[PDB]
Amino acid sequence: GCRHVAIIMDGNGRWAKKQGKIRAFGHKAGAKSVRRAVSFAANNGIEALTLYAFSSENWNRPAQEVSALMELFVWALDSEVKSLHRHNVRLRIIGDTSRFNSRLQERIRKSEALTAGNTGLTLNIAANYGGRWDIVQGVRQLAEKVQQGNLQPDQIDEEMLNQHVCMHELAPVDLVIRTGGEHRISNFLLWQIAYAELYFTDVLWPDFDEQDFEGALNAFAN
Amino acid sequence: LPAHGCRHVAIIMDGNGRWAKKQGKIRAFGHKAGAKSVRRAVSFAANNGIEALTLYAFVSALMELFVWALDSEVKSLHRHNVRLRIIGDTSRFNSRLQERIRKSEALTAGNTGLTLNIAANYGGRWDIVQGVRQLAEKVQQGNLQPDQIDEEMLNQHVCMHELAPVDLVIRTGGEHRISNFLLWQIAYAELYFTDVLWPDFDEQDFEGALNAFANRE
Ligand SMILES: Cc1ccc(Oc2cccc(NC(=O)c3cc([N+](=O)[O-])ccc3C(=O)O)c2)cc1C
Ligand SMILES: Cc1ccc(Oc2cccc(NC(=O)c3cc([N+](=O)[O-])ccc3C(=O)O)c2)cc1C
Ligand SMILES: Cc1ccc(Oc2cccc(NC(=O)c3cc([N+](=O)[O-])ccc3C(=O)O)c2)cc1C
Ligand SMILES: Cc1ccc(Oc2cccc(NC(=O)c3cc([N+](=O)[O-])ccc3C(=O)O)c2)cc1C
């Protein structure tokens, strides 16, 4: 029954600190664990996987370093997309991408467009996504319609707003996993998690493996 | 601020029916035991410096209980200096039915102790949509530009925006879901799940959840 899993991937920083290593070491192992989770979901017929990695710690850096990290994100996408495409994965980015420069925005769009026809796992990667932002994005759309005289306030209902928030084309989120020990959603999905199972594990993201993913799926089944 | 650090606790009070079934009792017995656990939790929050306590379990049988009890329960809240509010779509209740909820709110509205919000016919998606409808009405009036709508603005139109943010959500009964209780308001809340059934959740269990919050925050 588990069709759409969303994961808050916390623990790369603490993992690297436990290893006596710099944060970048944690993030390289974090990216290995991303690849492993995507492969496990695609090999087990999960229809959609939505991954959230954001921590303000990682981004509270001088502007030079922030632009640098943005380039590394798109490099990471560019360096994986041919593999994802060969495995029939549809890649989507959710979030506010208006902060990327034109060149990186076009690179993100190109990877989405390459894989958009694919019919296997849909992999949604959050980049500057917040659950309150996602709702507000939809609200501004409906507000524009009201202003244009094409929609009456009375006509706005849950199904309408749902069609304007991220991921409304996909199966509803069944299961949210958060690694790393904290027991909070931290303004990841909100509208979309109204009926999802919430599974919290103390395992740090770089250590979360196929066995840990199957235990999450068992909590759902139970 | 109390040592536990929690200003506003919200509780999904599940487990009343299972508690009655385990004992070979019919559901009404679980509801009566669940109501005693609600009074006990209200009293504990009032006594432990919590500013606001928001309770969900809200059906037909509990609605019949709601209408009955209401008067006697409000008199006891009033005597404990509790300010009562009902959140949710109360338009569904008949006009005599709405008047009584209204008189209870009015009676306690000057109370300076705990604010107790009882979520009745409430859903987290409904709460967001009613706030959206308020913004849409202001847009239609030409009072509000779509590009002025931001998170802070929508926050000021959802239930309980004038109380402290929800710090802690407790769900009893063993399930690990929010079940369309508060959604927008729990974006940053600590979530605490316990297998204890609601009629058995007592002051020590509430103290446990507060101290877990204090230590994890
Ligand atoms: C190549 C690459 C490698 C790592 C990248 O970045 C990741 C990837 C997976 C997981 C994480 N995860 C965290 O950095 C992380 C997330 C949360 N969180 O989402 O609430 C909290 C803490 C941390 C933390 O480890 O300090 C961060 C991002 C890229 C593009
Ligand atoms: C192969 C691979 C490896 C590591 C990956 O690591 C992730 C996974 C999920 C989300 C993110 N996402 C960001 O790293 C991310 C990047 C930018 N950015 O570059 O301006 C901004 C925000 C975020 C953000 O919200 O986390 C990064 C993602 C992939 C697809
Ligand atoms: C006004 C008010 C205030 C607090 C109230 O607090 C209670 C008291 C007794 C029982 C319940 N609540 C349930 O018994 C209850 C309701 C539903 N429900 O809506 O599906 C589901 C499960 C239970 C369950 O605990 O099994 C909730 C009930 C009411 C009517
Ligand atoms: C603050 C507040 C507001 C409304 C509330 O509304 C309910 C909800 C569920 C149950 C009850 N009330 C009983 O279930 C109940 C029934 C019988 N009975 O029918 O034999 C006797 C005593 C009680 C009793 O002590 O509560 C009352 C309960 C509370 C605690």
Q: Which helix (H) or strand (E) holds A142?
A: helix A131-147
Contact B144, A160 (CB under 8 A): no
CA distance B61 to A105: 56
- Top mutation candidate among B16, B87, B90, B101 for ligand 3, by most atoms within 8 Å of CB: B16
List of residues 6+ apart from B69 with CB closer than 8 A: B35
Q: Is A31 exposed, middle or buried (0-12, 13-18, 19+ CB in 10 A)?
A: middle
- A139, A161 contact by CB (below 8 A): yes
Strands of the sheet with A197-200, listed across from one edge = A90-94, A122-126, A48-52, A4-8, A175-178, A197-200
Residue B126 annotated as part of some ligand binding site: no
**3 state SS of A39:** helix
Q: Break chain B into its structural domains and give their ranges.
A: 1-217
Going by C-alpha positions, the residue among A128, A17, A147 that lies closest to residue A70 is A128
Residues 6+ away with beta carbon under 8 Å from B93: B101, B121
Task: Spell out the residues 6+ positions from residue B210 whose beta carbon is closer than 8 angstroms to its own.
Answer: B4, B6, B9, B48, B168
Q: Which residues contact residue B206 at a Cβ distance below 8 angstroms, ignoring those fewer than 6 apart?
A: B41, B44, B45, B48, B170
- Burial class of residue B108 (count of CB atoms within 10 Å of its CB; 0-12, 13-18, 19+): buried
Closest chain B residue to the Cα of A181, Cα to Cα: B216
Q: What number of other Cβ atoms are within 10 A of residue A139's Cβ?
A: 28
Pick B191's closest partner by Cβ from A158, A183, A191.
Answer: A183
Nearest to A153 among B124, B133, B145 (CB): B133
User: Would you give the distance in Å from CA B101 to the centre of its chain?
Assistant: 15
The three-state secondary structure class of A85 is helix
What are the angstrom distances between the C-alpha of B207 and each of B41, B48, B51, B154, B202?
A: 10, 9, 15, 33, 9
Kind and range of the H or E element at A177? Answer: strand A175-178
Which pair of tokens denotes residue B53?
């306590």
A154 interfacial to chain B (CB closer than 8 Å): yes
Which residue type does A203 have?
V
Host H or E run for residue A70: helix A63-86
Q: For tokens 């932002």, what's the residue?
A: A133
- The backbone torsions φ and ψ at residue A29, rounded to the nearest 5 degrees and listed phi first, read -70, -35
Using the Cβ of B182 and the Cβ atoms of chain A, whether some distance falls under 8 Å is answered with no
Structural element, H or E, at residue A77: helix A63-86
> Amino acid identity of B96?
R
What are B168's strand-pairing partners? B9, B190
What are the backbone angles phi and psi of residue A49, rounded to the nearest 5°? -130, 125
With tokens 């066995």, the residue in question is A211
Other beta carbons within 10 Å of B4? 21
Residue where the block lists tokens 């991220």:
A166
Q: Is B18 among the annotated ligand-binding positions? A: yes
CA diameter of chain A: 60
Written in H, E and C, the secondary structure of chain B is CCCCCCCEEEEECCCHHHHHHHCCCCHHHHHHHHHHHHHHHHHHHHHCCCCEEEEECCCHHHHHHHHCCHHHHHHHHHHCCCEEEEECCHHHCCHHHHHHHHHHHHHHCCCCCCEEEEECCCCHHHHHHHHHHHHHHHHHHCCCCHHHCCHHHHHCCCCCCCCCCCCEEEECCCCCCCCCCCCHHHCCCEEEECCCCHHHCCHHHHHHHHHHHHHHC
> Which of B117, B97, B198, B106 lies closest to B160 in space, CA to CA?
B117
Token reading at A22: 């710099």
Which SS3 state, helix, strand or coil, does residue A198 take? strand
Say if residue B95 is exposed, middle or buried (CB neighbours under 10 Å; 0-12, 13-18, 19+).
exposed
What single-letter DSSP state applies at residue A197?
E
- According to CATH, the topology of domain B1-217 is Undecaprenyl pyrophosphate synthetase (3.40.1180)
Separation between Cα atoms, residue A45 and residue A39, nearest integer Å: 10
Nearest-by-CA chain A residue for B180: A194
Contacts of B183 in chain A (CB under 8 A): 190-191, 193-194
Cβ-contact B210, B4 below 8 angstroms: yes
Task: Give the span between the Cα atoms of B23 and A133, in whole angstroms.
Answer: 47
B57-73 residues labelled b (16+ CB within 10 A) or e (exposed): beeeebeebbeeebeeb
**What separation in angstroms does the CA of B36 have from each of A64, B66, B114, B118, B126?**
60, 14, 18, 15, 29
Contacts of A64 (CB under 8 A, 6+ apart): none
Across the strands, what pairs with B84? B116
Gap between the Cα atoms of A40 and A2, Å rounded: 13
Coil vs helix vs strand at A175? strand
Q: At residue B7, what are phi and psi to the nearest 5 degrees?
A: -90, -35
CB atoms within 10 A of CB A172: 15
CA-based R_g, chain A, Å: 18
Q: How far apart are CA B84 and CA B91, in angstroms?
A: 18
Map B115-127 to HEC letters.
EEEEECCCCHHHH
In a 3-state reduction of DSSP, which class is residue A4? strand
DSSP line for A91-130: EEEES-GGGS-HHHHHHHHHHHHHHTT--S-EEEEESS--
Question: In this complex, do A182 and B216 lie within 8 Å of one another by their Cβ atoms?
Answer: yes
Task: Please check whether residue A2 is in contact with residue A217, taking contact to mean a CB–CB distance below 8 angstroms.
Answer: yes
What does this entry list as its resolution, in Å? 1.6
Q: Are strands B190-193 and A90-94 parallel, antiparallel or unpaired?
A: unpaired
Element (H, E) at A53: none
d(CA B94, CA A175): 38
Judge whether B100 is annotated as a binding position. Answer: no
Q: Which fold has domain A1-222?
A: Undecaprenyl pyrophosphate synthetase (3.40.1180)
Nearest CA to B53 among B79, B80, B30, B85?
Answer: B85
